[PDB]
Motif scaffolding. Sequence first.
Motif, mmCIF file in Angstrom:
data_model
loop_
_atom_site.group_PDB
_atom_site.id
_atom_site.type_symbol
_atom_site.label_atom_id
_atom_site.label_comp_id
_atom_site.label_asym_id
_atom_site.label_seq_id
_atom_site.Cartn_x
_atom_site.Cartn_y
_atom_site.Cartn_z
ATOM 1 N N UNK A 150 0.829 -1.214 0.000
ATOM 2 C CA UNK A 150 0.000 0.000 0.000
ATOM 3 C C UNK A 150 0.870 1.274 0.000
ATOM 4 N N UNK A 151 2.010 1.241 0.734
ATOM 5 C CA UNK A 151 2.925 2.412 0.893
ATOM 6 C C UNK A 151 3.557 2.802 -0.450
ATOM 7 N N UNK A 152 3.827 1.768 -1.254
ATOM 8 C CA UNK A 152 4.313 1.895 -2.633
ATOM 9 C C UNK A 152 3.274 2.641 -3.498
ATOM 10 N N UNK A 153 2.007 2.191 -3.411
ATOM 11 C CA UNK A 153 0.878 2.780 -4.167
ATOM 12 C C UNK A 153 0.531 4.199 -3.665
ATOM 13 N N UNK A 154 0.800 4.467 -2.371
ATOM 14 C CA UNK A 154 0.659 5.810 -1.769
ATOM 15 C C UNK A 154 1.773 6.736 -2.282
ATOM 16 N N UNK A 155 2.898 6.126 -2.699
ATOM 17 C CA UNK A 155 4.073 6.861 -3.138
ATOM 18 C C UNK A 155 4.821 7.514 -1.984
ATOM 19 N N UNK A 156 4.734 6.894 -0.790
ATOM 20 C CA UNK A 156 5.441 7.364 0.416
ATOM 21 C C UNK A 156 6.953 7.177 0.253
ATOM 22 N N UNK A 157 7.717 8.145 0.768
ATOM 23 C CA UNK A 157 9.177 8.194 0.619
ATOM 24 C C UNK A 157 9.854 7.317 1.685
ATOM 25 N N UNK A 158 11.156 7.051 1.480
ATOM 26 C CA UNK A 158 11.977 6.120 2.300
ATOM 27 C C UNK A 158 11.808 6.332 3.825
ATOM 28 N N UNK A 159 11.856 7.605 4.260
ATOM 29 C CA UNK A 159 11.696 7.949 5.661
ATOM 30 C C UNK A 159 10.312 7.645 6.186
ATOM 31 N N UNK A 160 9.274 8.105 5.463
ATOM 32 C CA UNK A 160 7.867 7.899 5.856
ATOM 33 C C UNK A 160 7.549 6.396 5.985
ATOM 34 N N UNK A 161 7.987 5.603 4.977
ATOM 35 C CA UNK A 161 7.818 4.137 4.959
ATOM 36 C C UNK A 161 8.397 3.517 6.241
ATOM 37 N N UNK A 162 9.654 3.864 6.567
ATOM 38 C CA UNK A 162 10.342 3.280 7.725
ATOM 39 C C UNK A 162 9.687 3.724 9.048
ATOM 40 N N UNK A 163 9.325 5.020 9.152
ATOM 41 C CA UNK A 163 8.832 5.620 10.414
ATOM 42 C C UNK A 163 7.471 5.040 10.815
ATOM 43 N N UNK A 164 6.578 4.859 9.829
ATOM 44 C CA UNK A 164 5.223 4.329 10.077
ATOM 45 C C UNK A 164 5.294 2.840 10.452
ATOM 46 N N UNK A 165 6.271 2.125 9.850
ATOM 47 C CA UNK A 165 6.616 0.749 10.234
ATOM 48 C C UNK A 165 7.157 0.734 11.682
ATOM 49 N N UNK A 166 7.986 1.747 12.036
ATOM 50 C CA UNK A 166 8.559 1.892 13.400
ATOM 51 C C UNK A 166 7.444 2.067 14.439
ATOM 52 N N UNK A 167 6.409 2.858 14.095
ATOM 53 C CA UNK A 167 5.265 3.132 14.990
ATOM 54 C C UNK A 167 4.477 1.830 15.272
ATOM 55 N N UNK A 168 4.248 1.035 14.201
ATOM 56 C CA UNK A 168 3.579 -0.284 14.291
ATOM 57 C C UNK A 168 4.398 -1.236 15.174
ATOM 58 N N UNK A 169 5.713 -1.281 14.912
ATOM 59 C CA UNK A 169 6.649 -2.130 15.654
ATOM 60 C C UNK A 169 6.666 -1.743 17.135
ATOM 61 N N UNK A 170 6.768 -0.434 17.424
ATOM 62 C CA UNK A 170 6.868 0.123 18.800
ATOM 63 C C UNK A 170 5.621 -0.206 19.635
ATOM 64 N N UNK A 171 4.441 -0.165 18.993
ATOM 65 C CA UNK A 171 3.182 -0.551 19.645
ATOM 66 C C UNK A 171 3.145 -2.073 19.890
#
Length: 118
Positions: free
Chosen positions: A62-83
């Motif tokens: 989905x992040x690919x189709x959103x066209x989210x950049x390298x930082x945004x992709x990693x950070x939102x994954x970090x938020x999921x991981x941290x929870x």
Amino acid sequence: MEPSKLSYGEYLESWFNTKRHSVGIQTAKVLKGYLNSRIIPSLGNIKLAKLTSLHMQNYVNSLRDEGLKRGTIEKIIKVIRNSLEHAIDLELITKNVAAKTKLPKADKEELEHHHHHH
């Protein structure tokens, strides 16, 4: 043993509220700006124990189709991981199902610091 009643979006709020005090208020706006936009309508509507690896896969695609950049992709994954880290801490889940989910061939933001790397 308490059953898997806690929906992930309900959990993300409970996680986020207390976490604003550790990340900072201006930083927190951005984390929840990612939550209610990305993670809540995808994984949040799903129960915390129903989060399988397929759900993290569909999210990254989905992040690919959103066209989210390298930082945004990693950070939102970090938020999921941290929870999910805190969900192991609360013993809600036995294993973080986003722990094997990292950023593809790309690095962090020269603008946005707090770069987590070995």
